[PDB]
Design an enzyme around this catalytic site. Sequence first.
Site, PDB file in Angstrom:
ATOM      1  N   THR A  85      48.886  82.663 104.345  1.00 37.25           N
ATOM      2  CA  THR A  85      49.807  83.739 104.046  1.00 37.25           C
ATOM      3  C   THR A  85      50.730  83.528 102.870  1.00 37.25           C
ATOM      4  N   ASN A 107      50.360  76.302 103.985  1.00 38.50           N
ATOM      5  CA  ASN A 107      51.364  76.715 104.974  1.00 38.50           C
ATOM      6  C   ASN A 107      52.187  75.509 105.458  1.00 38.50           C
ATOM      7  N   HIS A 139      44.555  86.346 115.347  1.00 45.63           N
ATOM      8  CA  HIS A 139      44.510  84.987 115.805  1.00 45.63           C
ATOM      9  C   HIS A 139      44.153  84.899 117.309  1.00 45.63           C
ATOM     10  N   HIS A 181      42.104  81.721 109.524  1.00 48.26           N
ATOM     11  CA  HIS A 181      41.749  81.942 108.131  1.00 48.26           C
ATOM     12  C   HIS A 181      42.283  80.731 107.389  1.00 48.26           C
ATOM     13  N   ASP A 198      38.015  67.639  81.466  1.00 48.12           N
ATOM     14  CA  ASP A 198      39.246  67.970  82.175  1.00 48.12           C
ATOM     15  C   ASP A 198      39.631  66.734  83.018  1.00 48.12           C
ATOM     16  N   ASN A 246      42.578  65.314  83.400  1.00 53.52           N
ATOM     17  CA  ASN A 246      43.811  65.446  84.189  1.00 53.52           C
ATOM     18  C   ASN A 246      43.777  66.669  85.150  1.00 53.52           C
ATOM     19  N   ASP A 256      43.787  69.875  85.184  1.00 55.94           N
ATOM     20  CA  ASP A 256      44.748  70.968  85.105  1.00 55.94           C
ATOM     21  C   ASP A 256      44.089  72.317  84.766  1.00 55.94           C
ATOM     22  N   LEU A 280      42.559  72.999  82.140  1.00 56.82           N
ATOM     23  CA  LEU A 280      42.679  73.272  80.715  1.00 56.82           C
ATOM     24  C   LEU A 280      41.965  72.229  79.866  1.00 56.82           C
ATOM     25  N   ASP A 289      40.932  69.286  77.653  1.00 58.37           N
ATOM     26  CA  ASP A 289      41.607  68.046  77.210  1.00 58.37           C
ATOM     27  C   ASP A 289      41.647  67.875  75.706  1.00 58.37           C
TER      28      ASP A 289
HETATM   29  C1  LIG Z   1      48.221  79.399  85.072  1.00 56.28           C
HETATM   30  O1  LIG Z   1      49.349  79.959  84.396  1.00 56.28           O
HETATM   31  C2  LIG Z   1      50.434  79.058  84.266  1.00 56.28           C
HETATM   32  C3  LIG Z   1      51.643  79.749  83.639  1.00 56.28           C
HETATM   33  O2  LIG Z   1      51.315  80.107  82.298  1.00 56.28           O
HETATM   34  C4  LIG Z   1      49.984  77.838  83.423  1.00 56.28           C
HETATM   35  O3  LIG Z   1      50.962  76.840  83.692  1.00 56.28           O
HETATM   36  C5  LIG Z   1      51.783  76.522  82.553  1.00 56.28           C
HETATM   37  O4  LIG Z   1      51.111  75.530  81.791  1.00 56.28           O
HETATM   38  C6  LIG Z   1      51.781  74.967  80.662  1.00 56.28           C
HETATM   39  C7  LIG Z   1      50.941  73.825  80.033  1.00 56.28           C
HETATM   40  O5  LIG Z   1      50.559  72.810  80.985  1.00 56.28           O
HETATM   41  C8  LIG Z   1      53.161  74.425  81.071  1.00 56.28           C
HETATM   42  O6  LIG Z   1      53.880  74.083  79.900  1.00 56.28           O
HETATM   43  C9  LIG Z   1      54.615  72.840  80.106  1.00 56.28           C
HETATM   44  O7  LIG Z   1      55.934  73.161  80.528  1.00 56.28           O
HETATM   45  C10 LIG Z   1      56.909  72.135  80.588  1.00 56.28           C
HETATM   46  C11 LIG Z   1      58.234  72.784  81.001  1.00 56.28           C
HETATM   47  O8  LIG Z   1      58.052  73.069  82.368  1.00 56.28           O
HETATM   48  C12 LIG Z   1      59.148  73.733  83.050  1.00 56.28           C
HETATM   49  O9  LIG Z   1      59.469  75.046  82.581  1.00 56.28           O
HETATM   50  C13 LIG Z   1      58.601  76.135  82.926  1.00 56.28           C
HETATM   51  C14 LIG Z   1      59.112  77.458  82.319  1.00 56.28           C
HETATM   52  O10 LIG Z   1      60.198  78.061  83.016  1.00 56.28           O
HETATM   53  C15 LIG Z   1      58.379  76.202  84.448  1.00 56.28           C
HETATM   54  O11 LIG Z   1      57.490  77.252  84.778  1.00 56.28           O
HETATM   55  C16 LIG Z   1      57.870  74.855  84.991  1.00 56.28           C
HETATM   56  O12 LIG Z   1      57.676  74.937  86.404  1.00 56.28           O
HETATM   57  C17 LIG Z   1      56.835  73.884  86.957  1.00 56.28           C
HETATM   58  O13 LIG Z   1      57.529  72.753  87.492  1.00 56.28           O
HETATM   59  C18 LIG Z   1      58.410  73.009  88.592  1.00 56.28           C
HETATM   60  C19 LIG Z   1      58.971  71.699  89.155  1.00 56.28           C
HETATM   61  O14 LIG Z   1      58.361  70.584  88.526  1.00 56.28           O
HETATM   62  C20 LIG Z   1      57.742  73.811  89.731  1.00 56.28           C
HETATM   63  O15 LIG Z   1      58.718  74.409  90.570  1.00 56.28           O
HETATM   64  C21 LIG Z   1      56.768  74.904  89.253  1.00 56.28           C
HETATM   65  O16 LIG Z   1      55.962  75.309  90.351  1.00 56.28           O
HETATM   66  C22 LIG Z   1      55.913  74.450  88.051  1.00 56.28           C
HETATM   67  O17 LIG Z   1      55.005  73.444  88.484  1.00 56.28           O
HETATM   68  C23 LIG Z   1      53.698  73.503  87.873  1.00 56.28           C
HETATM   69  O18 LIG Z   1      53.638  73.105  86.492  1.00 56.28           O
HETATM   70  C24 LIG Z   1      53.854  71.720  86.171  1.00 56.28           C
HETATM   71  C25 LIG Z   1      53.689  71.454  84.657  1.00 56.28           C
HETATM   72  O19 LIG Z   1      54.700  72.087  83.889  1.00 56.28           O
HETATM   73  C26 LIG Z   1      52.920  70.817  86.996  1.00 56.28           C
HETATM   74  O20 LIG Z   1      53.321  69.473  86.829  1.00 56.28           O
HETATM   75  C27 LIG Z   1      52.929  71.184  88.486  1.00 56.28           C
HETATM   76  O21 LIG Z   1      51.899  70.514  89.162  1.00 56.28           O
HETATM   77  C28 LIG Z   1      52.754  72.676  88.756  1.00 56.28           C
HETATM   78  O22 LIG Z   1      51.404  73.040  88.541  1.00 56.28           O
HETATM   79  C29 LIG Z   1      58.818  73.710  84.561  1.00 56.28           C
HETATM   80  O23 LIG Z   1      59.990  73.687  85.361  1.00 56.28           O
HETATM   81  C30 LIG Z   1      57.016  71.374  79.266  1.00 56.28           C
HETATM   82  O24 LIG Z   1      57.929  70.329  79.494  1.00 56.28           O
HETATM   83  C31 LIG Z   1      55.642  70.844  78.803  1.00 56.28           C
HETATM   84  O25 LIG Z   1      55.754  70.254  77.503  1.00 56.28           O
HETATM   85  C32 LIG Z   1      55.135  68.933  77.334  1.00 56.28           C
HETATM   86  O26 LIG Z   1      53.781  68.951  76.849  1.00 56.28           O
HETATM   87  C33 LIG Z   1      53.690  69.446  75.496  1.00 56.28           C
HETATM   88  C34 LIG Z   1      52.274  69.788  75.017  1.00 56.28           C
HETATM   89  O27 LIG Z   1      52.385  70.666  73.905  1.00 56.28           O
HETATM   90  C35 LIG Z   1      54.422  68.516  74.517  1.00 56.28           C
HETATM   91  O28 LIG Z   1      54.284  68.928  73.174  1.00 56.28           O
HETATM   92  C36 LIG Z   1      55.890  68.538  74.922  1.00 56.28           C
HETATM   93  O29 LIG Z   1      56.613  67.691  74.057  1.00 56.28           O
HETATM   94  C37 LIG Z   1      55.994  68.066  76.380  1.00 56.28           C
HETATM   95  O30 LIG Z   1      55.557  66.718  76.391  1.00 56.28           O
HETATM   96  C38 LIG Z   1      56.565  65.874  76.979  1.00 56.28           C
HETATM   97  O31 LIG Z   1      56.393  65.798  78.393  1.00 56.28           O
HETATM   98  C39 LIG Z   1      55.153  65.212  78.790  1.00 56.28           C
HETATM   99  C40 LIG Z   1      54.889  65.424  80.285  1.00 56.28           C
HETATM  100  O32 LIG Z   1      56.025  65.054  81.040  1.00 56.28           O
HETATM  101  C41 LIG Z   1      55.150  63.747  78.331  1.00 56.28           C
HETATM  102  O33 LIG Z   1      53.971  63.082  78.724  1.00 56.28           O
HETATM  103  C42 LIG Z   1      55.285  63.705  76.797  1.00 56.28           C
HETATM  104  O34 LIG Z   1      55.198  62.373  76.315  1.00 56.28           O
HETATM  105  C43 LIG Z   1      56.538  64.480  76.321  1.00 56.28           C
HETATM  106  O35 LIG Z   1      57.754  63.803  76.598  1.00 56.28           O
HETATM  107  C44 LIG Z   1      54.577  71.973  78.833  1.00 56.28           C
HETATM  108  O36 LIG Z   1      54.699  72.852  77.728  1.00 56.28           O
HETATM  109  C45 LIG Z   1      53.953  75.393  81.977  1.00 56.28           C
HETATM  110  O37 LIG Z   1      55.024  74.696  82.577  1.00 56.28           O
HETATM  111  C46 LIG Z   1      53.096  75.957  83.117  1.00 56.28           C
HETATM  112  N1  LIG Z   1      53.843  76.969  83.869  1.00 56.28           N
HETATM  113  C47 LIG Z   1      53.828  77.059  85.189  1.00 56.28           C
HETATM  114  C48 LIG Z   1      54.651  78.176  85.830  1.00 56.28           C
HETATM  115  O38 LIG Z   1      53.156  76.296  85.882  1.00 56.28           O
HETATM  116  C49 LIG Z   1      48.676  77.261  83.931  1.00 56.28           C
HETATM  117  O39 LIG Z   1      48.242  76.295  82.981  1.00 56.28           O
HETATM  118  C50 LIG Z   1      47.607  78.331  84.167  1.00 56.28           C
HETATM  119  N2  LIG Z   1      46.407  77.744  84.733  1.00 56.28           N
HETATM  120  C51 LIG Z   1      45.187  77.839  84.151  1.00 56.28           C
HETATM  121  C52 LIG Z   1      43.999  77.153  84.804  1.00 56.28           C
HETATM  122  O40 LIG Z   1      45.006  78.466  83.105  1.00 56.28           O
HETATM  123 CA   LIG Z   2      48.709  85.894 106.475  1.00 59.23          CA
HETATM  124 CA   LIG Z   3      42.831  69.117  81.048  1.00 60.34          CA
HETATM  125 CL   LIG Z   4      47.718  74.630 104.970  1.00 62.46          CL
HETATM  126 ZN   LIG Z   5      47.325  84.055 110.230  1.00 59.60          ZN
END
Ligand SMILES: *[C@@H]1O[C@H](CO)[C@@H](O[C@@H]2O[C@H](CO)[C@@H](O[C@@H]3O[C@H](CO[C@H]4O[C@H](CO)[C@@H](O)[C@H](O[C@H]5O[C@H](CO)[C@@H](O)[C@H](O)[C@@H]5O[C@H]5O[C@H](CO)[C@@H](O)[C@H](O)[C@@H]5O)[C@@H]4O)[C@@H](O)[C@H](O[C@H]4O[C@H](CO)[C@@H](O)[C@H](O)[C@@H]4O[C@H]4O[C@H](CO)[C@@H](O)[C@H](O)[C@@H]4O)[C@@H]3O)[C@H](O)[C@H]2NC(C)=O)[C@H](O)[C@H]1NC(C)=O
Ligand SMILES: [Ca+2]
Ligand SMILES: [Ca+2]
Ligand SMILES: [Cl-]
Ligand SMILES: [Zn+2]
Length: 805
Positions: free
Chosen positions: A159, A180, A265, A420, A683, A685, A687, A689, A691
């Site tokens: 859900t 969940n 359920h 489910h 890929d 890592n 993600d 996306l 590499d």
């Molecule tokens: C589906 O769609 C989504 C949304 O478009 C895609 O996800 C995006 O992908 C982007 C690329 O990976 C990513 O951009 C990064 O953002 C970093 C800033 O992140 C914060 O800010 C945003 C914006 O408000 C926010 O949304 C983020 O929220 C995440 O984290 C919090 C808590 O941790 C969670 O509550 C939340 O659920 C979300 O988690 C998810 O994303 C993170 C990754 O960001 C994962 O770790 C989790 O597992 C989870 O999936 C954040 O609060 C920014 O810092 C990054 O920049 C680094 O990398 C670039 C590369 O160009 C580099 O140039 C920069 O300098 C920087 O590098 C530095 O940091 C590195 C790593 O620590 C380090 O190794 C280096 O040496 C450097 O110091 C980066 O730009 C964006 O955050 C997410 N957005 C979301 C909402 O997830 C997704 O890819 C799509 N999926 C597919 C398959 O297409």
């Molecule tokens: Ca449900």
């Molecule tokens: Ca990748």
């Molecule tokens: Cl679950």
């Molecule tokens: Zn249910």
Amino acid sequence: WTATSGSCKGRCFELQEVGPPDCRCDNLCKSYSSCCHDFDELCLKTARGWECTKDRCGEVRNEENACHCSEDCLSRGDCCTNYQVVCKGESHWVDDDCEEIKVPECPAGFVRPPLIIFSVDGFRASYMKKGSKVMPNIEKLRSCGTHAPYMRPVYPTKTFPNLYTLATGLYPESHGIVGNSMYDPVFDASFHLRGREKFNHRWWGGQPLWITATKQGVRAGTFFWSVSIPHERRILTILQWLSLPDNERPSVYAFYSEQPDFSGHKYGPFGPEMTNPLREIDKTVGQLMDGLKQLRLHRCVNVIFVGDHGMEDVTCDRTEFLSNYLTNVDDITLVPGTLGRIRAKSINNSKYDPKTIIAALTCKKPDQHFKPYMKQHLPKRLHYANNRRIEDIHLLVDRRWHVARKPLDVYKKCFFQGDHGFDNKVNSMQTVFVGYGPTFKYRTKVPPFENIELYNVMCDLLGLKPAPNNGTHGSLNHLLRTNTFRPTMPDEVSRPNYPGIMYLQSEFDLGCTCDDKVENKLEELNKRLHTKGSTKERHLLYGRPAVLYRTSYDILYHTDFESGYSEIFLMPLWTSYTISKQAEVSSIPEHLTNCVRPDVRVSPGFSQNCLAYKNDKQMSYGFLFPPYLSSSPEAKYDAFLVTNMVPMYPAFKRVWAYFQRVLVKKYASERNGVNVISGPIFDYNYDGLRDTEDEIKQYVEGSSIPVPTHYYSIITSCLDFTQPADKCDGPLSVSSFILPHRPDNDESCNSSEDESKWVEELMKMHTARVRDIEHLTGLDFYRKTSRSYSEILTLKTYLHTYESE
Ligand SMILES: *[C@@H]1O[C@H](CO)[C@@H](O[C@@H]2O[C@H](CO)[C@@H](O[C@@H]3O[C@H](CO[C@H]4O[C@H](CO)[C@@H](O)[C@H](O[C@H]5O[C@H](CO)[C@@H](O)[C@H](O)[C@@H]5O[C@H]5O[C@H](CO)[C@@H](O)[C@H](O)[C@@H]5O)[C@@H]4O)[C@@H](O)[C@H](O[C@H]4O[C@H](CO)[C@@H](O)[C@H](O)[C@@H]4O[C@H]4O[C@H](CO)[C@@H](O)[C@H](O)[C@@H]4O)[C@@H]3O)[C@H](O)[C@H]2NC(C)=O)[C@H](O)[C@H]1NC(C)=O
Ligand SMILES: [Ca+2]
Ligand SMILES: [Ca+2]
Ligand SMILES: [Cl-]
Ligand SMILES: [Zn+2]
Ligand SMILES: Cc1cc(OCc2ccccn2)c(C(C)(C)C)cc1Cl
Ligand code: NA
Ligand code: NA
């Protein structure tokens, strides 16, 4: 502490939350134990129930009643929903003919049609046909509006993951609600269905629709409904809000029902007990629509009737126990049920080993009803890996089954008959979509689509710019009469090189040999033309893919195929070829078995080398364009170029070889020609996306040849299969896959058998959308077709599921 002795007088279901310990009157206060003392009395009135009766018409306003039948109720915005029907001789909305809503017909002061999301929990897709006789309000919405045969939920089909995906447009791995139940190692905190921790904001990532609206000046009704608020009161609250003054009135609203899930359920998805909950949901829709009609909003509001997931038959006796497989059961923690997630009971226990757990769970009993995976090996279509809250070890559980750690877990917790959570391709997990209103099309059926797409559309419906998400904006334009989003193709970032003959054979020292020095002015002019792209219109049907990142690559032409060859990764990013229905399969001649030929268009320094493969005892190689499908003995030499070679584990070559030798021709036969684009994916890592080069964890031994984590193929033909793939005048048909490049076939329990018993099953499991491949490669496909771009967007989101009807 809450000082719960302020008052809800005039504040019932306030839209803004007040700062504690001031008491609250919003629909969340029940959940926080924080409502004012008089919340029930003032805000949850029940006196006289929910319907007007003949004797109540034009009554004297009694402010104690649940809803009103007095003359002033319309302008107070608080009549029972059947007021006009009982007291003013009006018809119920469901009894009115449907009439096309060509334009919004809204009261003065409405800047935009409101959106009401009517969400139903556990509403399996086949209820639309199977319960049709007992759901007349839903069936009118469905037949008069825009509907899909079903809507695909995300994985896991639970859900909160699904509702938060509806709200955000994000995969659970990205929004963070990955199940969940959850443990977050950074927070060192747990999330559970029961309890309060689930309300902490750090669980909930991305940007949900109500925040997107607020940031952009659009007011939002509350989406979460405390369970003790009855449905009739949720509807009446929405209707009251809709009567607010223009500056105070939200533009977006949500209703949520716990049914039919709650009953499903207990009784299973088609239990005789299921008729009643479906009737009751339908009556609730009736109430909303009669309410909207009274407010003259029934041809103004866009209504979305959407479920979160379906429901499958599941009983206590269909439970697999990890204690029947593992001796060390007490050193592990299992998140159980319709999926499994395993981690170590203690991070102090360094004796714990994930490798030995997987192997103990792999193909151990003949009918085993779950399959273990490291998360990165899960089908890429699930997008279920890139979050620290998702355990490294995952169990995909067969539909109709549960997994539990020990038998005592199941009888010390048969109760349930439905559940489910399974793989989101499973038919029983599919749910519903209907859109009804001025912005949706009239009496229109659309193909099934994934719920990740709806956030973009709901943003379009509200004039909002969506936050970045996983939908493909424009892929659902065909749902909409107006407010469509007109996307542009992404710009190509790197243009290709077109190398000619630049290297002599003797400059290559790659350790490759080929038996090929066997000797015409007719066929020399002919071969040069093929190398210059003479057959390219045949093999590259939709234009070359655009490379959307900065890189160095060459286009290479051949008689039978065309490729985009990366000088950085030393192999093609893509290889394109068309196999007509009439094409013949041949074998690799004996003298050519181990043949690899230098490509005189490509420098030795940007080529692979055979010695690396010889030295690497684990790694062998395969070809992207299959030599089996060569058009002539002479063209076959092209297929052995070092530029068509890719690294392949021997175990994977069994898969690949069967695909290329048997299945390509089968599909061409069945589909009347196919165009195939194949390539590597990296890929490391997980993600989802592409590499960069500095992210690659494995190379062919002693070389700079990177090892793919996956191989893709996109297989395109004419939707009208009476036209051949290469001469198609209309819409396309596609199926694709992303096969994991693994050094064993442990995933396939029948792999000791002939490839014809297991390979195609594996490919089906790893079916994919073109869009998934685009993310994983930084390529953009279908750039040159005669189709509209929105149509191509829909095609790129298509998933071939291989479920029956
Ligand atoms: C589906 O769609 C989504 C949304 O478009 C895609 O996800 C995006 O992908 C982007 C690329 O990976 C990513 O951009 C990064 O953002 C970093 C800033 O992140 C914060 O800010 C945003 C914006 O408000 C926010 O949304 C983020 O929220 C995440 O984290 C919090 C808590 O941790 C969670 O509550 C939340 O659920 C979300 O988690 C998810 O994303 C993170 C990754 O960001 C994962 O770790 C989790 O597992 C989870 O999936 C954040 O609060 C920014 O810092 C990054 O920049 C680094 O990398 C670039 C590369 O160009 C580099 O140039 C920069 O300098 C920087 O590098 C530095 O940091 C590195 C790593 O620590 C380090 O190794 C280096 O040496 C450097 O110091 C980066 O730009 C964006 O955050 C997410 N957005 C979301 C909402 O997830 C997704 O890819 C799509 N999926 C597919 C398959 O297409
Ligand atoms: Ca449900
Ligand atoms: Ca990748
Ligand atoms: Cl679950
Ligand atoms: Zn249910
Ligand atoms: C339509 C809708 C409803 C909804 O919440 C409804 C709900 C579920 C469970 C218990 C109480 N109320 C949500 C969440 C994200 C869960 C707030 C999102 C959406 Cl799109
Ligand atoms: Na080898
Ligand atoms: Na096997």
